[PDB]
Amino acid sequence: XXXXXXXXXXXXXXXXXXXXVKMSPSVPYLPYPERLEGWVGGEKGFDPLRTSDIIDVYWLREAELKHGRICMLATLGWISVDAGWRFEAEMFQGVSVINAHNKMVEMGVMQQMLSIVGVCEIFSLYLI
Amino acid sequence: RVPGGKRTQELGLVIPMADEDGLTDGQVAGLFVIALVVFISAMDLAKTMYNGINPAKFKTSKGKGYISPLVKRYIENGF
Amino acid sequence: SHAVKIYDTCIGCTLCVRACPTDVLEMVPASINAAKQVASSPRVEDCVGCKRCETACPTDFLSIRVYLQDNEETQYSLGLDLVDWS
Amino acid sequence: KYGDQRKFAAVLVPLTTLVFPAVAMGMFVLYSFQEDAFWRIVPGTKRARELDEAWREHPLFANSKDPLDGLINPDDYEKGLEEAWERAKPAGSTVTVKDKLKQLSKQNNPHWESWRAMS
Amino acid sequence: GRCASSRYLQVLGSIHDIECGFGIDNTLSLNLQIFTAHWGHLTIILIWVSSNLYHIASNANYSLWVKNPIPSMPIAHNIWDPHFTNSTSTPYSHTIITTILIAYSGIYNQLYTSGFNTINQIYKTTFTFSCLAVISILLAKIHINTHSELLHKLASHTSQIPSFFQLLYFLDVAISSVNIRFNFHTGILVGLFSIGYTGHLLDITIPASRAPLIHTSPSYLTFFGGLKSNTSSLYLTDIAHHHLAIGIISILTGHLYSSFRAALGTYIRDILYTSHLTHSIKSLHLALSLILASCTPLTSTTAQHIYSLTPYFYLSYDHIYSTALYVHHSYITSFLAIASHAHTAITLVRDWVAPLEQESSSKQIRIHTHKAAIISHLSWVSLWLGFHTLAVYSHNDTCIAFNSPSKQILIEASNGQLIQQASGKALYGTINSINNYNKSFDSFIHPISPGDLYVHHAIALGLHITVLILLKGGLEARGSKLMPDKMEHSFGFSCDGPGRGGTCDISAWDSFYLATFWMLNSNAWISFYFHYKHLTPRQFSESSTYLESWFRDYLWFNSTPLIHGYSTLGANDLSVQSWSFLLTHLAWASGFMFLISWRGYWQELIDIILYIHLKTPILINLWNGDIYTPLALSIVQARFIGLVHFSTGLILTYPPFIIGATS
Amino acid sequence: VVAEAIPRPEDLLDSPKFPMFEGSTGGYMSRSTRERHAITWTAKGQAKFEMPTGGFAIMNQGENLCYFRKKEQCIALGKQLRKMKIENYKIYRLKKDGTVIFMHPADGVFPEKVNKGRVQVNGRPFTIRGNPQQSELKFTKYQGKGYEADPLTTMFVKARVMAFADVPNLFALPQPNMDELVPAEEVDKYTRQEYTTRMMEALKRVQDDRAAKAAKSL
Numbered sequence A: 001x002x003x004x005x006x007x008x009x010x011x012x013x014x015x016x017x018x019x020x021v022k023m024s025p026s027v028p029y030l031p032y033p034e035r036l037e038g039w040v041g042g043e044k045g046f047d048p049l050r051t052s053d054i055i056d057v058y059w060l061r062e063a064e065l066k067h068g069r070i071c072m073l074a075t076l077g078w079i080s081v082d083a084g085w086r087f088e089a090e091m092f093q094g095v096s097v098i099n100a101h102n103k104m105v106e107m108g109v110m111q112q113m114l115s116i117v118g119v120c121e122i123f124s125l126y127l128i
Numbered sequence B: 001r002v003p004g005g006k007r008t009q010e011l012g013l014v015i016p017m018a019d020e021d022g023l024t025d026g027q028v029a030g031l032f033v034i035a036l037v038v039f040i041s042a043m044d045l046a047k048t049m050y051n052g053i054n055p056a057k058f059k060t061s062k063g064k065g066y067i068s069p070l071v072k073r074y075i076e077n078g079f
Numbered sequence C: 001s002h003a004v005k006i007y008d009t010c011i012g013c014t015l016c017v018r019a020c021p022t023d024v025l026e027m028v029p030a031s032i033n034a035a036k037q038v039a040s041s042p043r044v045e046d047c048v049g050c051k052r053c054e055t056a057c058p059t060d061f062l063s064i065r066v067y068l069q070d071n072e073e074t075q076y077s078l079g080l081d082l083v084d085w086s
Numbered sequence D: 001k002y003g004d005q006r007k008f009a010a011v012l013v014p015l016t017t018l019v020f021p022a023v024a025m026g027m028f029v030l031y032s033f034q035e036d037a038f039w040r041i042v043p044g045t046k047r048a049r050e051l052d053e054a055w056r057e058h059p060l061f062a063n064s065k066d067p068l069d070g071l072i073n074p075d076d077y078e079k080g081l082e083e084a085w086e087r088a089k090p091a092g093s094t095v096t097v098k099d100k101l102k103q104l105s106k107q108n109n110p111h112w113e114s115w116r117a118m119s
Numbered sequence E: 001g002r003c004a005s006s007r008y009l010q011v012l013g014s015i016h017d018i019e020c021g022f023g024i025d026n027t028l029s030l031n032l033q034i035f036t037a038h039w040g041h042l043t044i045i046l047i048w049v050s051s052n053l054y055h056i057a058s059n060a061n062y063s064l065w066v067k068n069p070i071p072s073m074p075i076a077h078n079i080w081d082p083h084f085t086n087s088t089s090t091p092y093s094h095t096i097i098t099t100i101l102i103a104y105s106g107i108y109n110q111l112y113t114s115g116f117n118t119i120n121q122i123y124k125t126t127f128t129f130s131c132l133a134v135i136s137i138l139l140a141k142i143h144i145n146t147h148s149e150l151l152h153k154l155a156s157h158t159s160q161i162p163s164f165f166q167l168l169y170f171l172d173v174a175i176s177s178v179n180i181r182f183n184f185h186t187g188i189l190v191g192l193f194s195i196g197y198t199g200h201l202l203d204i205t206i207p208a209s210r211a212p213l214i215h216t217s218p219s220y221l222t223f224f225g226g227l228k229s230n231t232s233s234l235y236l237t238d239i240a241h242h243h244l245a246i247g248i249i250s251i252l253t254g255h256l257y258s259s260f261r262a263a264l265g266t267y268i269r270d271i272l273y274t275s276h277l278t279h280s281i282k283s284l285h286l287a288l289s290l291i292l293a294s295c296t297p298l299t300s301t302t303a304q305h306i307y308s309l310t311p312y313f314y315l316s317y318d319h320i321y322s323t324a325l326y327v328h329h330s331y332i333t334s335f336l337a338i339a340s341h342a343h344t345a346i347t348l349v350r351d352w353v354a355p356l357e358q359e360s361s362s363k364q365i366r367i368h369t370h371k372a373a374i375i376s377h378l379s380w381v382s383l384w385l386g387f388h389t390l391a392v393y394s395h396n397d398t399c400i401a402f403n404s405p406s407k408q409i410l411i412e413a414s415n416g417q418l419i420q421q422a423s424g425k426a427l428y429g430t431i432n433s434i435n436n437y438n439k440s441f442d443s444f445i446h447p448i449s450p451g452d453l454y455v456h457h458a459i460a461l462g463l464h465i466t467v468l469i470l471l472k473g474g475l476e477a478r479g480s481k482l483m484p485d486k487m488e489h490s491f492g493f494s495c496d497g498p499g500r501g502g503t504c505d506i507s508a509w510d511s512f513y514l515a516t517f518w519m520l521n522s523n524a525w526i527s528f529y530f531h532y533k534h535l536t537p538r539q540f541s542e543s544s545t546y547l548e549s550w551f552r553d554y555l556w557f558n559s560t561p562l563i564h565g566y567s568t569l570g571a572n573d574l575s576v577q578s579w580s581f582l583l584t585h586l587a588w589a590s591g592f593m594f595l596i597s598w599r600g601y602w603q604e605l606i607d608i609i610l611y612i613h614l615k616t617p618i619l620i621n622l623w624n625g626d627i628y629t630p631l632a633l634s635i636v637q638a639r640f641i642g643l644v645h646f647s648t649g650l651i652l653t654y655p656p657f658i659i660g661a662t663s
Numbered sequence F: 001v002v003a004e005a006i007p008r009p010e011d012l013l014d015s016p017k018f019p020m021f022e023g024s025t026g027g028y029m030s031r032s033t034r035e036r037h038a039i040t041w042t043a044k045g046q047a048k049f050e051m052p053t054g055g056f057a058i059m060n061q062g063e064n065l066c067y068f069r070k071k072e073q074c075i076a077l078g079k080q081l082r083k084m085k086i087e088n089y090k091i092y093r094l095k096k097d098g099t100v101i102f103m104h105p106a107d108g109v110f111p112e113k114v115n116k117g118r119v120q121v122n123g124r125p126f127t128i129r130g131n132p133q134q135s136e137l138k139f140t141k142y143q144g145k146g147y148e149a150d151p152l153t154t155m156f157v158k159a160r161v162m163a164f165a166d167v168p169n170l171f172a173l174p175q176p177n178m179d180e181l182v183p184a185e186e187v188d189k190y191t192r193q194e195y196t197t198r199m200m201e202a203l204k205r206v207q208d209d210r211a212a213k214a215a216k217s218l
């Protein structure tokens, strides 16, 4: 029973049979969020907090991918800079990753990257 | 400055001016970029408000529309 | 163009017809009053809006009512002389 | 120096208070001669007709302008009205409910929204 | 056929009257247009805030004013005008340095109190508010698309039953829902915004006002009183505690209506149905009227309490800030107050369904049953106040012109004095029961004299007459004895013809037009009272019981520095003030002809001018007038344009006088 | 009634039908206007009259013909003539192409005199106060034009006003079941006459449920 009930008006509604509801496989006690059906991850059917009951999934999957992609790079960046991989050019002797951000924004190379990320994200905003 | 008004002259009220610049040209340009973004978005919004809603989109536009699951609840919760 | 409406309270005065400066109103036969006649406004496209008909109507509240429509004005409803809209 | 922002002013002030206002006035007087000019307040514009017809094409707003819209079963309403009028019909009156309503719906106002003939 | 020159005025007179739009067919379109307009207006507000913050950051001296605020003066923005002297130096610049304007808004004290210390913080704030403007416009686009997507989802929508058409009424349930809106407004937008501002104060404002202290401990919530001695303003700890209390109260209140679930909270309809109300809450004009009537006490109390209990650092030390803020907010709240009545009249014209003739069930019905009694008693109280204020003022004027100051009728303001005495006893009992006493309340209670009594009677007269005109217009908007069909016509229309006695100024809009003059006059009285008492409390206390004192010791006397601004002796930094003074006098007088001279004269004049143009050699072969036919302004347009000129002149003539007198 | 052959005023220079009139700047503005109104009449004596466009005139003992820009001027001259016991005057509107439209004594009988075959145009069968409230006709055919409503609509809204004051006996409209209704429009069961039976049974179920719920604490 994908539908929340079976009726014609929501005063004489006949709720679906309890054993016949679809139910999420991740959270077994919750009904399946049908708005997620069709999207890639929509087989674990995990959406408690009901943030897809309110917001178009196109937005959330856009935000989910951007977070994951940006974290996959950031995790690699932190690991490599910590293991010690400073770029070939000089002026890149930040000694430690934790102080790399404040060091580089002082040097002047972070303002460049923030601009380059900014323009691509503004282009992303038009795309989204 | 040539002050006017009794109180400014009889109290010595002065208007200090910074000898520095305030904001550098780079900061003004950074503000102007986002001002231009506001400007483009506002022109688009003005166009959309001028033309208004198009109800006949269901005959030509793709997709099938969407009512968010909370919007349905708000519909059937009352008015 | 304005909107000149005639209501049932008309008693066939013919004063409204006589007061109209652009021949908007006319008398039609009827059976709702002792005069056996009521006013009609077949040509409100020529109604300038002077409301002389309302001044001339002697019923308790005017049996003829002129509703001004300024976002509707035509060349006849404005009395244009120096300029033609046709 | 405390100046050096006047380099921005010498371009922006003449621009936004002379070039933009003049271009805006010229564009406004040009827009005034479009057939679409002020289509939301000026009667008899083409776009107003297209918008009204587009609204009427929507399945929800088909019978939206009808003041009598709402009667779920108009046949039941008409039958009940006819039955109620039959018991109250005065003596040998020859007026039926159907033609009475038909002639009460048909009025004679030729000069109403006649501006729907140009665009 | 096509239009005439009056098309521009006709269109612009209802350019934002979205109910009068031609394509709009349903409440869905109206509500969505209104919502998008709200988003655009919020964007405009955010851009204005960012504008002020930028100009304080770039073309100003916040970094120097913050150091020595009492004698220093803030800068609004630079002056770049090619009309000034390219030689010498203007009176607005320190010789070769750039030209500047002194800010009289009060943003400097606002930012200083809020915790700003550096220009960089103001620049970042400007950037953030521009970002918020972008966000608001994008939200407008988002909501337009979501509603259009619901509309498109009606291409996959059917109830399989004839009841499917019921969905027509629920398409704009997002905007038109009331219980959810009330719950979330009163809870989040009020209470939690107050709580967040308490957090802001505790984290920044109080830390950046004194020596370093404990980690924002609960000792930051005090109950001192008012007017911290050093900065002559309210304690920031008191402000944080006040916002915390208001936030808690409003958060608790916000759980009242049934917002998200049908099992919690009571419905507003059921609340009204069992009370003396049950109004038509689906009217947008009614909601607008009753929220404009809510912003009016808020703005009036803002004007009163920014001055009486100054909340910003060194705000009382500025002789121009205190008057300018009060006058500005008094004018804003007067406009909102008359707006409430105007939209109540529009509600009665457009969005009110009434019973047949006698069903006295609606509140508007019961008001309309005895509307004549209301208007007659309002006229009586207005007449009494006018007669007995003007007559006593005339007595004082005559007896003081006749060298007899002791023959005046000076009613001691005993009732206001009793209220002040009770409040002062309460405050003194509060203070005496403190181990940290010797507090100050600035102008919360002020010396009240017979002049105060007479001015208060004049203000009550003005309020009574403004309410009289507005209430009469609202109650007779749907029909009076003179014109018993007024609800068949528009809210604003020219007249009902010269017959039936003559019917000039008969519409409800004409009642608003008449009432705006009285709103302006009452506001002028209030502002004159405040400014006169501000300039010299002693001279006001003694010589303000006769109107000649108001004419001489205030207007004629205090206008000396302003007229001397630019003359044949040099110029001051008040030159703009004097020039704007004269320009606003010209604007005020220019609107007299739109009010006194009426259309037909000018229509004949325009016909003569058009005759000339169609008779001039070259013009006639290029322009026959058939396209945009020049016509005299219509009657309602003429009244509105004259009202606009009069309002602009009366309002904008005052700030130059304030600046010349106080600065 | 036979319309005459009123020629365009720019092609009838120096006509014997023109009355002797002084001539002023008040005449119709050529070079900008092409629509002219013409009034013709037959007089008995050369009685002086006043032109509607300034200046006086003397009629002709036979036919007369005048040209004016506005119908109002022609009607004013017609009233002036009729005061002099001159009937049989006709007023024509000349189109730009020269088409002659017969306007004032439209059916040959003056509008103040009852003539058979006329029908009350723009007539409303009630007192002026009988018009429906503007608030009732919002977003209908008569959005801001309550005085244009047909009498059936006025009676319908009057009955609605009568009904929507007995609040306790009203029927609240059931809330639609959005989540489980609303399939694709191709997914319908047709049977339109059965759909009203489904309406009847569903509304009966709704009313029975409401009565059962009300009879719990009432």
Ligand code: CLA
Pocket (backbone or CB within 6 Å): E586, E589, E590, E591, E592, E593, E596, E597
């Ligand atoms: C101070 C108020 C004021 C002003 C300025 C005017 C102005 C005018 N009245 Mg008027 N009038 C007024 C009050 C006023 N009236 C009042 C209270 C009444 C009582 C009913 C009348 C009754 C009245 C009648 C009955 C008549 C006039 C007429 C006139 C016009 C003839 C004078 C003229 O053409 O000069 C030019 C106008 C000026 C204002 C002179 C100054 C022009 C400025 C300084 C120069 C240009 C500024 C510059 C271009 C800036 C550009 C604008 C900016 C946005 C860029 C003129 C438009 C007569 C008319 O129109 O006949 C021709 C006429 O018949 N008036």
Ligand code: CLA
Pocket (backbone or CB within 6 Å): A026, A036, A039, A040, A041, A042, A043, A044, A045, A046, A047, A050, A051, A052, A053, A057, A060, A061, A062, A063, A064, A067
């Ligand atoms: C910003 C990160 C982010 C975003 C936007 C999304 C977005 C999405 N996820 Mg996803 N996910 C994430 C991180 C994220 N994910 C992480 C880190 C995990 C690993 C645990 C998962 C595991 C996961 C599964 C297993 C599934 C999804 C699914 C989905 C989709 C529907 C769920 C929804 O509506 O939530 C979108 C909205 C949010 C995520 C907002 C949450 C923000 C809250 C307020 C933060 C709360 C956490 C907080 C940091 C912890 C507090 C700290 C302390 C107090 C304890 C949607 C596209 C489902 C799917 O594929 O559907 C198509 C699905 O089955 N996600």
Ligand code: CLA
Pocket (backbone or CB within 6 Å): A070, A071, A072, A073, A074, A075, A076, A077, A078, A080, A081, A085, A086, A087, A088, A091, A092, A093, A094, A097, A100, A101, A104, A109, A110, A112, A113, A116, A117, A120
């Ligand atoms: C989340 C992504 C991310 C971020 C924000 C950073 C941030 C930083 N890295 Mg880094 N890094 C990352 C991922 C990331 N890293 C990964 C994945 C690797 C492994 C290959 C590294 C390897 C690395 C090294 C070896 C070093 C840094 C260093 C630095 C610091 C200085 C970089 C600099 O000056 O700009 C340099 C870059 C630019 C000026 C512009 C580059 C062009 C941009 C990044 C691409 C275009 C923008 C946009 C993303 C378009 C792509 C779209 C795409 C989705 C299709 C700075 C704190 C330096 C450091 O900390 O030591 C001093 C350093 O030496 N990084």
Ligand code: CLA
Pocket (backbone or CB within 6 Å): E376, E377, E379, E380, E383
């Ligand atoms: C017989 C005389 C008479 C009486 C008994 C009243 C009685 C009343 N008038 Mg009133 N009135 C009168 C004459 C009178 N009026 C005249 C002549 C005018 C025209 C100026 C008005 C104009 C007027 C207004 C505009 C208002 C009233 C109002 C009222 C009521 C409140 C009291 C008030 O405002 O008084 C104050 C009265 C005045 C300010 C008017 C001046 C009084 C006149 C000059 C007295 C004339 C008396 C007459 C000469 C006696 C001759 C006797 C002799 C022939 C034997 C009250 C019912 C008010 C109301 O309706 O509130 C309930 C209100 O708003 N009256």
Ligand code: CLA
Pocket (backbone or CB within 6 Å): E381, E384, E385, E411, E412, E413, E414, E415, E416, E417, E448, E452, E453, E456, E457, E460
């Ligand atoms: C229409 C009548 C009217 C109105 C609207 C006002 C309005 C106002 N008065 Mg006021 N006053 C009035 C008549 C009125 N007064 C009369 C007749 C007197 C006696 C001379 C006073 C004496 C008075 C004093 C001493 C003070 C005020 C103050 C105030 C202000 C504060 C409200 C207040 O406490 O008033 C009190 C409420 C009333 C007076 C309402 C009474 C209304 C009745 C009908 C008036 C007629 C009464 C009658 C003459 C009594 C005769 C007695 C006799 C039989 C022995 C407010 C603006 C105070 C103020 O502004 O301080 C800053 C203040 O201190 N009033």
Ligand SMILES: CC1=C(/C=C/C(C)=C/C=C/C(C)=C/C=C/C=C(C)/C=C/C=C(C)/C=C/C2=C(C)CCCC2(C)C)C(C)(C)CCC1
Pocket (backbone or CB within 6 Å): B029, B032, B033, B035, B036, B038, B039, B042, B043, B045, B046, E039, E040, E041, E043, E044, E047
């Ligand atoms: C490329 C670039 C650049 C350039 C830039 C620019 C060119 C800028 C400009 C800018 C600008 C030039 C800006 C402007 C702006 C404006 C604005 C921002 C305004 C706004 C407004 C609003 C927002 C409002 C609106 C509205 C209205 C009023 C109407 C109705 C509707 C609405 C509400 C929408 C540089 C090199 C530097 C740097 C790099 C990048």
Ligand code: SF4
Pocket (backbone or CB within 6 Å): C006, C009, C010, C011, C012, C013, C014, C015, C016, C017, C038, C039, C053, C056, C057, C058, C059, C062, C063, C064
């Ligand atoms: S004046 Fe009035 S009552 Fe007389 S005929 Fe004309 S409409 Fe009828």
Ligand code: SF4
Pocket (backbone or CB within 6 Å): C004, C019, C020, C021, C022, C023, C024, C025, C046, C047, C048, C049, C050, C051, C052, C053, C054, C066
């Ligand atoms: S308003 Fe004037 S022109 Fe129009 S019908 Fe009445 S009298 Fe005739």
